[PDB]
Amino acid sequence: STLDEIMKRGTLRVGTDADYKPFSFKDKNGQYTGFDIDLAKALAKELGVKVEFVPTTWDGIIPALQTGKFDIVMSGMTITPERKKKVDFSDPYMTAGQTILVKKDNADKIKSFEDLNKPDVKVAVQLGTTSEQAAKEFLPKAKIRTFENNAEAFQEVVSGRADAMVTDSPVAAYYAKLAVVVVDEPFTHEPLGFAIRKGDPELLNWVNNWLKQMKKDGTYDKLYEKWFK
Numbered sequence: 001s002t003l004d005e006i007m008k009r010g011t012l013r014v015g016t017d018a019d020y021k022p023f024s025f026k027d028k029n030g031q032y033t034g035f036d037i038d039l040a041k042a043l044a045k046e047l048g049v050k051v052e053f054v055p056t057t058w059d060g061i062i063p064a065l066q067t068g069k070f071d072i073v074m075s076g077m078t079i080t081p082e083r084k085k086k087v088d089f090s091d092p093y094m095t096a097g098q099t100i101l102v103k104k105d106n107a108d109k110i111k112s113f114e115d116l117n118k119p120d121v122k123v124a125v126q127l128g129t130t131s132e133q134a135a136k137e138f139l140p141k142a143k144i145r146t147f148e149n150n151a152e153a154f155q156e157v158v159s160g161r162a163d164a165m166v167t168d169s170p171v172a173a174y175y176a177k178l179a180v181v182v183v184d185e186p187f188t189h190e191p192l193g194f195a196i197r198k199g200d201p202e203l204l205n206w207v208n209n210w211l212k213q214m215k216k217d218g219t220y221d222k223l224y225e226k227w228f229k
């Protein structure tokens with residue numbers, strides 16, 4: 001079990017794609033910070049070990065996990081059926097819907113998702129995310145442009161090279177304040193979880209127990225309100 005491996009080695013290795021505010025990012029001193037980071041820290045404490053963060057590109061984050069580059073994904077990861085087939089998820093630690101971001105100027109042209117499903121519309125998303133999937137399914141006439149990082153996608157919409165970007169609601173809000181604008185999607189919210197390799201119920205139970213505990217004893221709420229005020 002990875003649990004044994006973790007405790008022997010003395011360190012918890014957390015796979016994270018660390019340009020994803022407010023879940024995981026660098027502060028002004030290039031230090032790891034965010035909701036997922038604080039949670040990672042809490043879990044490490046529970047485990048009696050130190051934390052090490054393993055920066056990983058989002059698109060390959062599941063393969064990195066499956067090939068043992070780290071023990072656990074804590075990186076704003078939505079639980080999906082397709083992903084459940086590859087890894088195991090903890091109980092939900094959060095919920096996020098899909099939000100559309102546009103230039104304040106172009107806020108007039110865009111009531112909803114449907115308004116983006118035209119052939120002249122370019123929409124930016126992070127590669128390998130639920131936002132990519134949502135756009136590809138629900139905006140098939142549009143031009144979807146993908147990016148390794150959200151920051152570039154943000155940059156594409158500001159520069160005018162894209163008409164919009166789709167991202168998780170809490171990320172969209174965080175990018176808004178940086179004087180661009182949000183338009184909201186009523187269609188679907190989904191739970192986020194932490195991912196681990198299959199065949200490790202000791203670690204899964206431990207994580208779930210730990211999480212359960214933090215929701216019981218106030219520690220989680222303190223942390224939620226800290227990042228989502």
Ligand SMILES: NC(=[NH2+])NCCC[C@H](N)C(=O)O
Nearest residue numbers: 017020058076077078129130
């Ligand atoms: N750190 C990141 N880049 N996270 C992107 C996650 C986006 C979306 N919640 C998903 O799980 O697909």
